[PDB]
Amino acid sequence: YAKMPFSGVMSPIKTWDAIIFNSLKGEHKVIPQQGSHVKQSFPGAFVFEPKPIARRYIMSFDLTSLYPS
Amino acid sequence: YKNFEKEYRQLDYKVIAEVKTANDIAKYDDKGWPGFKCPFHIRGVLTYRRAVSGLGVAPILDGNKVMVL
Amino acid sequence: IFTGWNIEGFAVPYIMNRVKMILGERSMKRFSPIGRVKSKLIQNMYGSKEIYSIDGVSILDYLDLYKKF
Amino acid sequence: KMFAEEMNAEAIKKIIMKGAGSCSTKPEVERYVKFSDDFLNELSNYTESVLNSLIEECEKAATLANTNQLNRKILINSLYGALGNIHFRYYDLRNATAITIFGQVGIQWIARKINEYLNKVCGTNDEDFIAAGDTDSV
Amino acid sequence: KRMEDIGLEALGMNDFKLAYISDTYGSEIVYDRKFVRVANCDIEVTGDKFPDPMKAEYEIDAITHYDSI
DNA sequence: GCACGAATTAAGCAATTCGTAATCATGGTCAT
DNA sequence: ATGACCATGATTACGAATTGC
């Protein structure tokens, strides 16, 4: 589905590069060359602070694929 | 809690002792006795080596999983 | 020769990152007379910051010059 | 498509457990879609072996559809991890920081709104109803 | 290398394997699992000392290799 | 520090444990 | 006689060093 060599499937970075290039070439566009940036740490996953007590009646919810959304 | 405190004691010593993978025994292997900041499992391994000293049975070496009591 | 006090730590990087983030790399590379602005990433002492190298002008941080000479 | 294939699996199992007949003909069966009602009616008399042939085809179609589903899910889930690796081709720190900070702000905002609405409905005040939340679930 | 020395972006897919796949297949690929030869190997070597992956000292007594086609 | 290449992210507490101190619970022999 | 004080084991804290996702 991504039109790559097999082993690349063990590498997400390549998995997307290939699919994006396929879709982009599909309408005769051009992909920018790979540049260079810094290995930098940014804020990540955030977790609430629960008070260690007992919960009797409690409900729950979630976000369907939050980051792609 | 009470009845399991009872049952655990009569259980076999080969089903209740903590399972831990033993490695780097050598650096704590001081005269066959536990070294400084010796983990529980390394301490147990060295106790085994002293106990099996003179018995001529299979000893323990770096990287061998053990069961500690 | 393009100097200043603590220049590769706060001046050179900030100006070049801002021109990249505002004008694009095609104008960021206009600093050098030969059109080559390659970013080195390491500063391995704590791995904190990043140095820059504009091929054609000799960056010489006056803070380092004073610290060493 | 996988929903379709599973409902055809149930239908063919029903056909095999009620009704049978000798039909040596093995006509081609449409794939990636649901069979027509008239067709499955005329192949209802497939004893078991001929029905089993249909059952195996339906099972392999369902398996391929499921594997495509997991393909899509893994790609979607790995996109974010791809867009934050400095060796990616479209890496841009502003993008990753934007999506992460937006996730944090959105989850905390939804928690705040939940607290407000629950306090309004219950009539109490300033009681933190949220028990524990990750970046997405709560 | 020549254009990178100048400093202008060299657009296009740097890895030519993806270029080959994109150019010479193009349309959606249809494949069958009965033609891919996937193999499963397992080994068993009789030796006194613990097996060392780089030394390759002993002979090999048990080899098993499963083929799909 | 020396081009050239796989990009699964280091670090935060999590949790452990031993050395030693401070401190406390208690006995041995004493001034009485 | 009767504690009273010096000497002798538990007890908990803190510090220093080591992995784990």
Chain E, nearest residue to A25 by Cα: E22
C-alpha A48/C-alpha A50 separation (Å) is 6
Contact call for B and D: 3+ CB–CB distances under 8 Å:
no
C-alpha D95/C-alpha D82 separation (Å) is 12
Q: How far is CA B42 from CA B29, B52, B61, in A?
A: 8, 15, 10
Tell me the longest C-alpha to C-alpha distance in chain B: 42
Mutate to test the interface with C, among E1, E5, E11 (most CBs of C within 10 A): E5
User: Residue A41, annotated ligand binder?
Assistant: no
D55–chain A nearest CA distance, Å? 27
| Structure-token pair, residue D109 | 């905002």
The residues of A between 25 and 64 with beta carbon within 7 Å of nucleic strand F are 39, 41
Q: Tell me if E18 and A25 make a contact (CB, 8 A cut-off).
A: no
Q: Which nucleotides of F are covered by protein (CB under 7 A)?
A: 1, 6-10, 16-19
A12-25 and E16-24 helices, crossing angle to 10°? 40
Phi, psi of C50 (to 5 degrees): -130, 140
**Angstrom resolution of this structure:** 3.7
C-alpha C19/C-alpha C11 separation (Å) is 12
| String of DSSP letters for C13-53 | HHHHHHHHHHT-HHHHTTSSTTS-EEEE---TTTT---EEE
Q: Name the one residue in this structure whose structure tokens are 């193999």.
A: E39
C-alpha E38/C-alpha E65 separation (Å) is 10
CA nearest neighbour of B17 among B47, B41, B53, B43: B41
Residue C44 contacts residue C35 (beta carbons within 8 Å): no
| Structure-token pair, residue B22 | 């033993």
Tell me how crowded residue B1 is: count the other CB atoms within 10 A of its CB: 5
C-alpha D115/C-alpha D108 separation (Å) is 10
Residue E37 contacts residue E68 (beta carbons within 8 Å): yes
User: Which residue has the least CA–C1' distance to nucleotide F6?
Assistant: A11
CA nearest neighbour of D115 among A44, A48, A45: A48
Chain A residues 23-52 with a CB less than 8 Å from chain E: 25, 30-34
Phi, psi of D123 (to 5 degrees): 80, 0
Instruction: Classify B55 as helix, strand or coil.
Output: coil
Q: Which helix (H) or strand (E) holds D66?
A: helix D49-82
E7 Rama sector, left if φ>0, alpha if ψ -120 to 50, beta otherwise = left
Cα C2 to the center of its chain, rounded Å: 10
Q: How far is CA E39 from CA A9, A35, D40, D67, E61, in A?
A: 18, 39, 40, 21, 20
C-alpha D42/C-alpha D44 separation (Å) is 6
Phi, psi of D62 (to 5 degrees): -65, -40
C-alpha E1/C-alpha E56 separation (Å) is 42
Adjacent-strand bridge partners of C52: C39
DSSP code at position B19: E
Residue B62, CB, strand G, below 7 Å: no
C-alpha B37/C-alpha B28 separation (Å) is 8
Q: How far is CA A48 from CA A29, A62, D135, D136, E30, in A?
A: 44, 14, 8, 11, 47
Residue D88 contacts residue A33 (beta carbons within 8 Å): no
Q: Which of A39, A44, A48 sits opposite D130 (nearest CB)?
A: A48
Residue D77 contacts residue A65 (beta carbons within 8 Å): yes
Give the pairing of strands C51-54 and B18-22.
Answer: unpaired
Instruction: Classify B22 as helix, strand or coil.
Output: strand
Give the pairing of strands E39-44 and C51-54.
Answer: unpaired
Q: D130: burial class by Cβ within 10 Å (0-12, 13-18, 19+)?
A: middle
C-alpha B22/C-alpha B45 separation (Å) is 8
Residue D54 contacts residue D67 (beta carbons within 8 Å): no
A53–chain D nearest CA distance, Å? 9
Residues B26-29: contacts with CB under 8 Å, at least 24 apart = B26/B62
| Structure-token pair, residue A44 | 């990540």
Residue D17 contacts residue D47 (beta carbons within 8 Å): no
Q: How far is CA C36 from CA A33, C54, D112, D129, in A?
A: 15, 7, 50, 57
C35–chain E nearest CA distance, Å? 5
C-alpha C59/C-alpha D131 separation (Å) is 55
Q: D66: burial class by Cβ within 10 Å (0-12, 13-18, 19+)?
A: middle
- List, in order, residues 6 or more apart from A66 with CB less than 8 Å away: D103, D135, D136
Residue B37, CB, strand G, below 7 Å: yes
| Structure-token pair, residue D71 | 């393909």
- Strands annotated E in E8-61: 39-44
Q: Which helix (H) or strand (E) holds D106?
A: helix D93-122
Tell me how crowded residue D37 is: count the other CB atoms within 10 A of its CB: 8
| Structure-token pair, residue B20 | 């831990």
C-alpha E3/C-alpha B50 separation (Å) is 70
C-alpha D104/C-alpha D109 separation (Å) is 9
Integer Rg of chain E from CA: 23
In one-letter notation, the amino acid at residue A28 is H
Instruction: Classify A68 as helix, strand or coil.
Output: coil
C-alpha C28/C-alpha C11 separation (Å) is 14
Contact list in C for residue A38 (CB cut-off 8 A) is 39, 41, 50
Residue B60 contacts residue B45 (beta carbons within 8 Å): yes
Instruction: Classify E65 as helix, strand or coil.
Output: strand
The counts of H helices and E strands in chain B are 4, 2
Give the pairing of strands E62-67 and E39-44.
Answer: antiparallel
Contact list in A for residue E29 (CB cut-off 8 A) is 3
